[PDB]
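Subject: complex prediction, re-run

Hi both,

The earlier run crashed halfway through, so I resubmitted it with identical inputs.
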Amino acid sequence: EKIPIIVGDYGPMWVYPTSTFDCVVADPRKGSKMYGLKSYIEYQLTPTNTNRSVNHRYKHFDWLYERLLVKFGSAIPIPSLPDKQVTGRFEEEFIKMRMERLQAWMTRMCRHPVISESEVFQQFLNFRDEKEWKTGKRKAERDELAGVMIFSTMEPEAPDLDLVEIEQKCEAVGKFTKAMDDGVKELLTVGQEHWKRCTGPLPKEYQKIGKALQSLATVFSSSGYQGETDLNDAITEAGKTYEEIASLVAEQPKKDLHFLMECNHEYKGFLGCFPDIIGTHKGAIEKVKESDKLVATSKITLQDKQNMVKRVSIMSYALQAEMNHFHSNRIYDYNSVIRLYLEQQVQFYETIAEKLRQALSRFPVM
Amino acid sequence: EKIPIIVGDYGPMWVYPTSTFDCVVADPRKGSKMYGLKSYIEYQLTPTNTNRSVNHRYKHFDWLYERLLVKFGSAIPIPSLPDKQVTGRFEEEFIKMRMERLQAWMTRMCRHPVISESEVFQQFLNFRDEKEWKTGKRKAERDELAGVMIFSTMEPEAPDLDLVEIEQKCEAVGKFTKAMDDGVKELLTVGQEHWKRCTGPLPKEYQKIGKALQSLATVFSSSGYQGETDLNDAITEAGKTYEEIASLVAEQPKKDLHFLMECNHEYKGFLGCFPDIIGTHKGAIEKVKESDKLVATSKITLQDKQNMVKRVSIMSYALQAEMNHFHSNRIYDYNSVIRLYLEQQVQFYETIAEKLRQALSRFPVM
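This time it finished cleanly. Structure:
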């Protein structure tokens, strides 16, 4: 099973294929298994590498998830699959957001140099027989090259680093991830906090204003003063213009804030995984310090000792390999969502301004 | 003393001069009257009609106020002079807002067809000797043509109106003013409410955001990942950009909301003069209903009766005359402040947008 690690300017990294490939997930189908009124939803996965489509119910993705988690979980963070919700198994909204989350989940895997070209993931996609599948699902479940053993399939195209060099790279990752986790948890709180404020009390204000104005115009109109008519219209419109800004405001987070939040959630997810991934490397590095203590107590041999080293190094490269894939994608992701949030923001203010500028051009120069 | 009332399409109205004139008030001077460390502030009133300047301490305006109130108070609402404040007699802020309120107060009087061309108001302005003034202040205080008597100087260039027609115009004014008063009191509340929200909790938010972002960039920068540098700068700047929006926001009401509020206060003031002002007329109209009852009880004569009528009509024309001056100016005033508030609003949103659009363009492109 080929899992190579090469070095570079940025340091170790996986070998990214030259012939990249993604995958689409849509067309919420409906399929069946004698139970009466209990038909599970089925999605369609259309790879790009070969155009040959396939179907999969949510339960199969969960299955896929556990496999990937069990197989590489000790080295590669595995994207979280969405929760198992409010018993709303059948309408527009539900399938939509779920299919949205599955789409993003699939693309993550497809983009991963190591996962995307594994047997389990691959066979998960390209399969014809309704039984050619059962065979794979079976082969998958008996693959003992999982857990820590996955490192046994990795081949570093570089020298050894002592136990020392290993422990150090471990600490580093552990300090970055904890830091970024703490950092994203805030960005998430203020955002959720700002969100809650733009969809609630803020609109009501512009709503109270716009109404306050309109009632006043109504009062002037009862004045019964010769020589007026033009103003009460300008006023009344200003109010209605404000009411629309109330709507525009209360309906904006769904166009920008939302994406910024989602991106952060996805990442809070990757981060939540390091607590585990880091405890295993720590134990591994700690177990390699006893090498000397062991060799002297005549428990193992120098060859056994030297293996423990060349072996725990592979671990680092894999956790070096994984981070390098992380950072790579982190930098791309935040640069796109922020770029997106701002753009939407801009248009937002620009739009409001134009709305005011209109009600304005209704009041004479005097 | 000429105080004529003519009729028109809109009905009775004062005779507005053809050669209009305003007056400026600025340059907070400092005068002295041997008390030691007790020098009262003095303002400078520069009429436009003749360019000859004059000085006046606040105490003199109060004096002017009482005179105008005593003289025409039974027919013309007299703008309120600002309160007598927090014992902060000497700095930037205080004199500024006070001088602002005096300026607007003077312009109100200058714009009034009846007040502007009265002896007391006029002499208040154009006077040379430090004694030529004492003479006027003296002449003013002995003018018995005040209170109800002011109507004796009014000349209606129109026929007589009957008690019925009178009571009706009275009710009307009473219903409009009460209505508009109630209406402006709200516009004032939401505004004060919106104000308090833009100078407090709202900025703190954009402040928390901008900081949340900046801490996060700080965390990424500790990552120690080969292949990044450009993003943490874009992020950190976005935060600082938000902090500036916090300032911009918390500092906006002073540029628009403020004028809109002030205009409403001034008017809440005219309205508060309600009452008094339409229950001398109310009493007058009520006293004219007893005309018949009297003439029959042989208390007065038909000639006496017919006088009461032609006489209470003059009152209406003078009042009616007052409203027509009110509405006239009301329509101009609201059309200018609203026009002003919007314009400022527009620029506000336009500015914020431009600020975002900048942090946006810090975007790479990768």
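Chain A touches chain B through 67 residues (CB under 8 Å).

- K.
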